[PDB]
RNA sequence: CUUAGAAAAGUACAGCGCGGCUGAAAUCAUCAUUAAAGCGGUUCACUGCCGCACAGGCAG
């Protein structure tokens, strides 16, 4: 059982339980980990260490979303569990308008969960994106201990989210059914690394992770020759073979209330909202059964707003490169243009 | 180092019957395109013969 509320305050352009009155329940923390099936992940809390945390959905926000989202069919998505919880649909559709820069163009993931946050559906969570990037870092570190990626940028080419279902394995018969959205986003990403020299492509593609947000991210064989390292992103951007796509940025304007959220959504119905970071409800503490013996802390997902940026002249890369700032009260990946 | 680790929604199907858009019309008077202009072989493919040839063949 968890009852503790938010410990700390968040910036105005990030959403958490602190911005809304949480007295919609149905302060002690005492949970089990060894036999429980709750989720558990690891993120870097420092340049040389990681932090384990188990993001748990806050029923306050889910209710605050179910109550408001009715009569908003244009931006409402419904799901039945085992019970009907409506969430925030992402617009209507997806249109298609240092040195040593490394590219992995045209990465397609098939069957990636779109229920990033418990109160929205759409593009997969940027937390999962950063986890995939860091898994790539770990895989490439075994063959080269001096390889670090300072920051990355994500370009989306094709986005498609529709209702599907997971056929649970038999445990006799199959357990209670579950309905969750899935996505097949086609995306390309840029990497800023400190290697500062060329690396052989065979090990680079051998170390490329496949899993991405419970999906299968694989790159076409004929695009292997396009995996090359360039010293300048200005010429790197002119190089990838896809002339269509969008760049992801953060919405710095205020989104304090869900009414203001829907007001912001209705001017363009093109921006998307998904999980961007985690707000810890408990300070990092060690428990006997962690993911890898690191400090564990029950956290809560934060919903942000992803902007659309068309790269061109007079477009600073500082507005499109994301990284994990590792704040003491929350762990989130945001673009480095915000001070 | 990804609400991490895993997952087959699939089997059948006849939309069918019938139909009058019809009545009437004036597009309509007038009009100045005007002025001004080098496209240039220096030699180069000539002169004889035959044949009746506005025919067709010879040589230097």
Q: Which nucleotide is closest to A127, CA to C1'?
A: B2
CB A272 within 8 A of CB A281: no
- Residue A232 CA and nucleotide B13 C1' are separated, in Å, by 62
Rounded to an integer, what distance in angstroms lies between the CA atom of residue A187 and that of residue A84? 31
CB A137 within 8 A of CB A144: no
- Residue A52 CA and nucleotide B23 C1' are separated, in Å, by 87
- Residue A143 CA and nucleotide B60 C1' are separated, in Å, by 94
Beta bridge partners of A76: A88
Q: What is the 3-state secondary structure (H, E, C) of chain A?
A: CECCCCCCCCCCCCECHHHCCCCCCCCCECCCCCCCCCCCEEECCCCCCCEEEEECCCHHHHHHHHHHHCCCHHHEEEEEECCEEEEECCCCCCCCCCCCEEEEEEEEEECEECCCCCCECCCCCHHHHHHHHHHHHHHHHCCCCCCCEEEEEEEEEECCEEEEECCCCCCCCCCCCEEEEEECCEEEEEEEECCCCCCCHHHHHHCCCCCCCCCEEEECHHHHHHCCEECCHHHHHCCCCCCCCEEEEECCCCCCCHHHHHHHHHHHCCCECCEEEEEECCCCECCCCCCCCCCEEEEEEEECCEEEECCCCCCCHHHCCEEECCCCCEEEEEECCCC
Q: Is A312 exposed, middle or buried (0-12, 13-18, 19+ CB in 10 A)?
A: exposed
Count of CB atoms situated within 10 Å of the CB of A231 = 14
Residue carrying structure tokens 């002690």: A28
Strand-strand pairing, A296-303 and A51-55: parallel
Declared resolution, Å: 3.4
CB A5 within 8 A of CB A49: no
A148 touches strand B (CB under 7 A): no
Solved using: cryo-EM
A39's CB contacts (< 8 A; 6+ apart) are: A54, A55
A157 touches strand B (CB under 7 A): no
A38 touches strand B (CB under 7 A): yes
Residues 225-254 of A with CB under 7 A from strand B: none
């Amino acid at each position: 059982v968890i009852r503790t509320q938010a410990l700390g305050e968040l910036p105005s352009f990030l959403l958490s339980s602190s911005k809304i009155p949480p007295y919609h329940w149905s302060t002690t923390i005492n949970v089990t980990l060894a036999p429980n099936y709750l989720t558990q992940i690891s993120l870097p809390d420092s340049d040389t260490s990681y932090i384990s945390l188990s993001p748990v959905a806050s029923l306050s926000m889910q209710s605050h979303f179910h109550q408001r989202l009715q009569d908003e069919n244009r931006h409402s998505a419904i799901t039945r569990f085992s019970g009907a919880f409506r969430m925030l649909k992402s617009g209507a559709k997806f249109s298609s308008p240092n040195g040593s820069f490394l590219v992995l163009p045209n990465i397609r993931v098939c069957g990636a969960t779109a229920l990033s946050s418990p109160v929205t559906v759409g593009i997969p969570s940027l937390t999962a994106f950063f986890g995939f990037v860091h898994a790539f870092e770990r895989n490439i570190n075994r063959t080269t201990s001096s390889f670090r990626v300072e920051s990355f940028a994500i370009c989306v080419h094709q986005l498609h989210v529709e209702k599907r279902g997971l056929t649970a394995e038999f445990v006799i018969s199959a357990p209670a059914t579950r309905d969750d959205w899935q996505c097949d986003v086609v995306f390309s990403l840029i990497l800023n690394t400190n290697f500062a020299q060329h690396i052989d492509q065979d090990t680079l593609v051998t170390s490329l992770p496949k899993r991405l947000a419970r999906g299968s991210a694989k790159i076409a064989i004929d695009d292997f020759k396009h995996i090359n390292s360039f010293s300048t992103l200005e010429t790197a951007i002119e190089s990838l073979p896809i002339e269509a796509g969008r760049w992801l940025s953060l919405y710095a304007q205020s989104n304090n209330n869900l009414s203001d959220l829907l007001a912001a959504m209705t001017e363009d119905h093109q921006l998307m909202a998904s999980c961007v970071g985690y707000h810890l409800l408990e300070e990092p503490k060690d428990k006997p059964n962690s993911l890898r013996g690191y400090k564990h802390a029950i956290a809560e997902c934060i919903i942000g707003l992803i902007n659309s940026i068309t790269f061109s002249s007079e477009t600073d890369p500082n507005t499109i490169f994301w990284s994990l700032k590792n704040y003491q009260n929350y762990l989130v990946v945001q673009p480095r243009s915000i001070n």
